[PDB]
């Protein structure tokens, strides 16, 4: 068993230190993963010092004891991630252990409105009796937003499905709201709205039928 | 040894055995390395599953010993993974990947105590569950110019009621790249998935460029090549 701290911040520009702590450590070098989400995890510390080809040299490693450290000199925005180390148990026939991460925040990123895009329903779906409006928001942060559907002027409530804020490439977030009606519902209303609020500030879209 | 890959049934209901297989290409499986298994539940940190040796000893994860068989198939220049009395708590995403020899002993050389997987597999996605597998509806999002910035416009895939998941999805068999945003999906309470995708494209294209959206959903052996055009 391997220890890491849950959660750990840093600014732009300086320096961080995680540890990884296991009696496992004394015997066998520990090894770093980076894992982004959505992507597969990518080694970047064989152990001790020694790093994979393409990784900067921001990144180093050391180990002393039953500790290993993982050092990011000079962060930048691209370090925000999961980090695991890895390693060889020392007891038994020497299962392989993991640590339980540590997600990195870095501190000082910019903030950012949601854009929203809203989708009516298509031809083809309303020939298939049915109808969903579609809700895009991306590019927003920090990762924090609400989303309130409207029929006419009137909150609708019932039949809306959104997802909770993931993290897009550029740091910054994304996320989808649906809203699932009836044919007969989407012609019987003059228009339906969707209001994503970020921040303190709001933005509406409105689709009609037509 | 340049390329590994799995490949598996995506669906397992409970109490049932998962059984997955890695096919090494570009290298010999007769190495002198420990394949390994490796997974991650959702939201969840990694988890090592065991290893074996191409003459066939292996060494277990001590939590999943008593369901857990990994076997080397030397003909096919493969090794597989198999998982009995599955639950919900094993669903998860599975990888496989290489790890380097090592000694168990006090006076080897200095580099026989490290420990890595420098090369790791794309992952696949197995959800134990008691439902059934159903393909996707895809339904075109025509065009709309509103919402970005001057002379372009948005358009899109709408990917209804799949399970389960993945579903990838690419525009005019790859060649079109650039603006492609595929969103996460949302999970319905009929236990359904649904996702969009949506690409930027110049609005002085609309009428004269062709757009398809290419959907694959493995699990169901579905692909569905939708076209997207202005109302």
């Known amino acids: 068993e391997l220890t890491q701290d849950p959660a750990v911040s840093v600014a732009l520009g300086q320096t961080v230190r995680i540890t990884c702590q296991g009696d496992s450590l004394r015997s066998y070098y520990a090894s770093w993963y980076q894992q982004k989400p959505g992507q597969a995890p990518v080694l970047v510390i064989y152990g001790k010092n020694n790093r994979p080809s393409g990784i900067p040299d921001r990144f180093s490693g050391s180990s002393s004891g039953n500790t290993a450290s993982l050092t990011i000199t000079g962060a930048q925005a691209e370090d925000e991630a999961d980090y695991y180390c890895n390693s060889r148990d020392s007891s038994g026939n020497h299962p392989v252990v993991f640590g339980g991460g540590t997600k990195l925040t870095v501190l000082g990123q910019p903030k950012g409105a949601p854009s929203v895009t809203l989708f009516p329903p298509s031809s083809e779906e309303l020939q298939a009796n049915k109808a969903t409006l579609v809700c895009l928001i991306s590019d927003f942060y920090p990762g924090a937003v609400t989303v309130a559907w409207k029929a006419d002027s009137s909150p609708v409530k019932a039949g809306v499905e959104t997802t909770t804020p993931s993290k897009q490439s550029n740091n910054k977030y994304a996320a989808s709201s649906y809203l699932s009606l009836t044919p007969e519902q989407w012609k019987s209303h003059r228009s339906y709205s969707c209001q994503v609020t970020h921040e303190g500030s709001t933005v509406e879209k409105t689709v009609a039928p037509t | 040894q340049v390329q590994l890959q799995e490949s598996g049934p995506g669906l397992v209901k409970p109490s049932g055995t998962l059984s997955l297989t890695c096919a090494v290409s570009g290298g010999s499986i007769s190495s002198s390395n420990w394949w390994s298994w490796v997974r991650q539940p959702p939201g969840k940190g990694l988890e090592w599953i065991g290893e074996?040796?191409?003459?066939?000893?292996?060494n277990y994860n001590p939590s999943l010993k008593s369901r857990v068989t990994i076997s080397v198939d030397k003909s096919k220049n493969q090794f597989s993974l198999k998982l009995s009395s599955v639950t919900a708590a094993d669903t998860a995403v599975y990888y496989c990947?290489?790890?380097?020899?090592?000694?168990?002993?006090?006076?080897?050389?200095?580099?026989?105590?490290?420990?890595?997987?420098?090369?790791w597999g794309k992952g696949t996605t197995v959800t134990v569950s008691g439902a059934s597998t159903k393909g996707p509806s895809v339904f075109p999002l025509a065009p709309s110019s509103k919402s970005t910035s001057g002379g372009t416009a948005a358009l899109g895939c709408l990917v209804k009621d799949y399970f389960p998941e993945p579903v990838t999805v690419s525009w005019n068999s790859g060649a079109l790249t650039s603006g492609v945003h595929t969103f996460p999906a949302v999970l319905q309470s009929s236990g359904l998935y649904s996702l969009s995708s949506v690409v930027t494209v110049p609005s002085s294209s609309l009428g004269t460029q062709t757009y398809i959206c290419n959907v694959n959903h493995k699990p169901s052996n579905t692909k569905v090549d939708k076209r997207v055009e202005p109302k």
């Open positions: 074996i040796y191409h003459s066939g000893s292996t």
């Open positions: 990947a290489r790890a380097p020899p090592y000694c168990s002993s006090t006076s080897c050389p200095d580099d026989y105590y490290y420990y890595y997987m420098d090369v």
